[PDB]
Amino acid sequence: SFVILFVTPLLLLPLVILMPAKFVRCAYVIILMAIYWCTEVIPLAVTSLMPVLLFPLFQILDSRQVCVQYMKDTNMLFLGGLIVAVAVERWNLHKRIALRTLLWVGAKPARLMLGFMGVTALLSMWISNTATTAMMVPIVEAILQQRKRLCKAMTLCICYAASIGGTATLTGTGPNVVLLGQMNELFPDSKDLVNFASWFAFAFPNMLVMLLFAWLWLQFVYMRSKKNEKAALKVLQEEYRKLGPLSFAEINVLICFFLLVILWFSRDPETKYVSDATVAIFVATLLFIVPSQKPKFYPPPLLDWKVTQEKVPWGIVLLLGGGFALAKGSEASGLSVWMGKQMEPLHAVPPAAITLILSLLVAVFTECTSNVATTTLFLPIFASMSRSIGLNPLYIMLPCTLSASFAFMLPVATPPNAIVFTYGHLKVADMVKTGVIMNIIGVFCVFLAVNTWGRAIFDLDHFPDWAN
Amino acid sequence: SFVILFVTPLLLLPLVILMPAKFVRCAYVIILMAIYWCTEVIPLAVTSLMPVLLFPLFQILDSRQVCVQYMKDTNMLFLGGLIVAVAVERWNLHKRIALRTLLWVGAKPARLMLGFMGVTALLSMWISNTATTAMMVPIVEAILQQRKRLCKAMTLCICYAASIGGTATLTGTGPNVVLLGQMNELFPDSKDLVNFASWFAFAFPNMLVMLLFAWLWLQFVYMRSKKNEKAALKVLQEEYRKLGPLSFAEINVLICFFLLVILWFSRDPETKYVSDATVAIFVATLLFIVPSQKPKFYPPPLLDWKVTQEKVPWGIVLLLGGGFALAKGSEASGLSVWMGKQMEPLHAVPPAAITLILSLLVAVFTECTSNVATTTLFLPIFASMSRSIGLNPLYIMLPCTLSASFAFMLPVATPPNAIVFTYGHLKVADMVKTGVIMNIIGVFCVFLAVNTWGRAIFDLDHFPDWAN
Ligand SMILES: CC(C)(C)c1ccc(CC[C@@](O)(CC(=O)O)C(=O)O)cc1
Ligand SMILES: CC(C)(C)c1ccc(CC[C@@](O)(CC(=O)O)C(=O)O)cc1
Ligand SMILES: *[C@@H]1O[C@H](CO)[C@@H](O)[C@H](O)[C@H]1NC(C)=O
Ligand SMILES: *[C@@H]1O[C@H](CO)[C@@H](O)[C@H](O)[C@H]1NC(C)=O
Ligand code: NA
Ligand code: NA
Ligand code: NA
Ligand code: NA
């Protein structure tokens, strides 16, 4: 039942009030926040707000030293991305790109599945995986209403494509922002090593491989009659024409998005001040002053504030802050040092086995919790391991955060799967059967990526000095 | 027109790019953000996000040193207050307290006005002045539909009562939180001198005086037939019974609110860690696990997350951060020192005249802009003045922030007045005529308060050492 999850663990709080060793107190905080992460008896952001409420009582950190960790460059970056995504959503743009791509590739189940997967991934690279699948599934439903395995195939394709595309852009989804925050906190001498450009270079090639493998696996398991070609076009056309002409505002938001991309990349092809958060905020601001209509007086702009107050995941701006506060408390108390001293004997196990095992463990784990909690709970542990054995932490921290996005079964794993399920014929057993193999595929692809071309970018074959 | 406000000022940006003196650059940033404060061509939060976008370009602060100033104890305090206010709003509680008070005082225009003003003030002490007036005006409309001066009187009473009650609790409204943030930033050795208790002691007596004077002034200007007594009761009763019985959840939220009050006060009747933000977060968290219904299984709690994501002013969590970033940039660049050296000659003007003049200036100013922008623009200036002449900064910083809430004409001054106007018969001239006198009243009351009983609490007759 739901009662025990937050009444029995609290009963241990008087146990550890004295506990003349702060790292025990920080460990209890982390364990409690993890127990509340996996089961949502209490929402995620509320659990993120717990460190300010517990570190003081445990005499670890003051209230200010804890709260001033809840906003940093990473949160601003994610917030700017979210606002741009709101601008994209308000004007039905993505529903235009998608419905043009579908009419381009064709109306054939083999090609139609590829179109849906590719579109969903490309959108999810910037558009908050949940939202893009929420937008795309209705199109699939409309098509289907006009065997029993095509339905499952397409429904799974939406979610897998979203979860895979998300792990290409540093914004993408929470886990990558969490990685950036942990790198800035634990390893601050890494001024800018995981940027938008570096992460995009390391990860974008990977998601193409994962998408190809997923498409092959799906068309092998569920696909192993011209009406379904001549009656899906009659739906795509009649759901495309409803969008009207090119909608002048869409052009301006597209231009702003391209400017955002160009500024993110061109920046990194003397006392830098101008990190990517500045760019994201710049474009988010520009979105409020652009006309959105032909002046012929300045017509109503692209974005009001009501829209971006109603439609913005603000809780994921506190969740990452909770992660950062946890990292700060771990550094202050002495938990990271203890974990480092308790993981020396791993100096004999070869690093590749460590990376593979931990990636598989994280992939299994994230089918129960959310994909952000997994990272903010695991990454400090792997970072402490790496310092103590003589590795470059990125070796173990990149595949882990890529794997945390491998939620391919257990609808509870990530919202997209739940959204896909809500529509009917996607019995859960099918998800498990088709998702275990996809988790294996993702782990193999990630291992290949990190061991082949992620070593030249980050120099993972040497032990640096920003990890003392 | 709206075009010039954000295309001509930007044209000065290339002028000051070089400008081998950082304080000029910080001054330009502040002036631009002020110009965008007064006229809302670009929303307020977006302007608050500007420092991260401009200080880097001007080589004042990095992006992290700027963004890590956007969350602090004050923002958490205000956020907890906001969440509790959401819990109050979701269950129509305040509409129960109010409609019981109205039936208690009576149905007579003289007594009815007092009931409305007192209720609106008491609610606004915790409930985000805008929201309480939004809730209360419909009751007045319902009553009126069943001379032409009663309408104006009641409509003005709602807004004046809200704006006056807000300035009693440290949360209350933005200006007081801004004062707390500026005290923590500019004067950090003032560990805890303006708390909830101290501010409540200094300000709560003042708002009773202001409410009494406002009620007298209104009943003198607009009030200088038993049907209006026997047909407002027939409305209050029929709008009270619709609320049903005491609504078990209301009891629990009331208990949580009382616990919040008791924890805020009892705390201050060795290396403190437990500032009021901890209490606010504690109660905000408790609001998510309390049943909200009789278990008889844990029924749905008082607060979900959808409700507190839809209904929470998140932008005022970035606005205060913008204020703090401005203060940090002023300290870093060298603008505060310059302003201190340019305000020595005021060492001859007696302090009381300074306080009165500045309070009146701020009261006039805040009839154009918002009440938060005024404080975050003025308070650093007054703080720099005080250090250089030999005063206790609170002397000039308390009345200024109390006066910034004196928006009693010019609907654009603060949202409550606009809400009141939207209902009809409140011609603007009436607002000016009845508001100039009320601004004078507020200034006089504030001067009396600070000069009589605000000197013992804060020791304003000596120059401390937390102001070097
Ligand atoms: C509680 C709120 C509403 C603030 C919230 C928190 C976390 C997410 C996760 C979004 C995700 O990153 C998926 C993932 O991380 O599992 C994606 O892009 O779909 C979404 C919303
Ligand atoms: C832009 C958003 C929506 C974030 C926003 C900003 C500022 C306020 C002010 C609230 C005020 O403090 C009045 C006052 O300060 O003028 C009160 O309590 O009514 C309200 C909302
Ligand atoms: C930094 O490096 C020094 C030299 O090995 C090491 O002793 C010290 O513990 C390290 N400090 C941190 C904060 O990593
Ligand atoms: C603190 O006090 C010293 C002594 O007067 C003064 O010289 C110095 O400028 C002050 N520093 C700050 C940061 O106020
Ligand atoms: Na995404
Ligand atoms: Na998951
Ligand atoms: Na208020
Ligand atoms: Na105002």
Q: How many CB atoms are closer than 10 A to CB A215? A: 20
Alpha helices in A267-314 (DSSP H): 276-286, 306-310
Q: How many CB atoms are closer than 10 A to CB A138? A: 12
Distance from residue B388's CA to the centre of ligand 4 (Å): 12
Query: What residues in A contact B6, CB-CB < 8 Å?
Result: 289
CA distance A101 to A119: 7
CA distance A62 to A43: 24
Contact (CB<8Å) B274/A64: no
What type of residue is A312? V
Distance from residue A74's CA to the centre of ligand 3 (Å): 26
List C-alpha distances in Å: B68 to A186, B34, B189: 16, 22, 20
Most informative mutation of A74, A129, A405 for ligand 1 (most atoms within 8 A of CB): A129
How do the residues of chain B divide into helix, strand and coil, expressed in percent and rounded to 5?
A: 70, 0, 30
Instruction: Tally the residues of chain B.
Output: 468
Resolution in angstroms for this experimental structure? 3.1
Contact (CB<8Å) A61/B273: yes
**Among B188, B182, B180, which residue's Cα sits nearest to residue B325?**
B182
To probe the interface with B, which of A25, A61, A64, A187 has the most B CB atoms within 10 Å? A64
CA distance B260 to B102: 26
Contact A464, A392 (CB under 8 A): yes
Q: How many CB atoms are closer than 10 A to CB B13? A: 14
Per-residue b or e along A95-126, where b marks 16 or more CB atoms closer than 10 Å to that residue's CB: bbebbeebeebebebeebbbbbbbbbbbbbbb
What type of residue is B173? T
Contact B401, B175 (CB under 8 A): yes
Residue B54 structure tokens: 């401009």
Indicate if the alpha-carbon torsion angle A416, A132, A308, B67 is positive or negative. positive
List C-alpha distances in Å: A345 to A175, A350, A352, B242: 29, 12, 16, 70
Q: Is the CB of A374 under 6 A from ligand 1?
A: no
From the list A53, A63, A309, the residue facing B285 with the nearest CB is A53
Contact B128, B169 (CB under 8 A): no
Contact A23, B285 (CB under 8 A): no
To probe the interface with B, which of A17, A41, A74, A309 has the most B CB atoms within 10 Å? A309
Q: CA nearest B316 in A: which residue? A: A309
Contact A324, A368 (CB under 8 A): no
Residue B226 CB contacts under 8 Å (≥ 6 apart), including other chains? none
By what technique were these coordinates determined? cryo-EM
Residue matched to tokens 């307020």: B44
CA distance B65 to B60: 10
Contact (CB<8Å) B273/A314: no
Instruction: Tally the residues of chain A.
Output: 468
Q: CA nearest B6 in A: which residue? A: A289
Torsion of CA B101, B102, B106, B112, to 10 degrees: 120
Instruction: Output phi, psi for A236, to 5 deg.
Output: -65, -40
Q: CA nearest B7 in A: which residue? A: A289
HSE toward the beta carbon, residue B391, CA cutoff 13 A:
25
Angle at CA A412, nearest 5°, toward A406 and A417? 65
Closest listed ligand to the CA of B319: 2
HSE toward the beta carbon, residue B185, CA cutoff 13 A:
32
CA distance B199 to B449: 12
Residue A393 CB contacts under 8 Å (≥ 6 apart), including other chains? A186, A187, A382, A383, A386, A387, A467
B244 in helix, strand or coil?
Answer: coil
Distance from residue A118's CA to the centre of ligand 1 (Å): 21
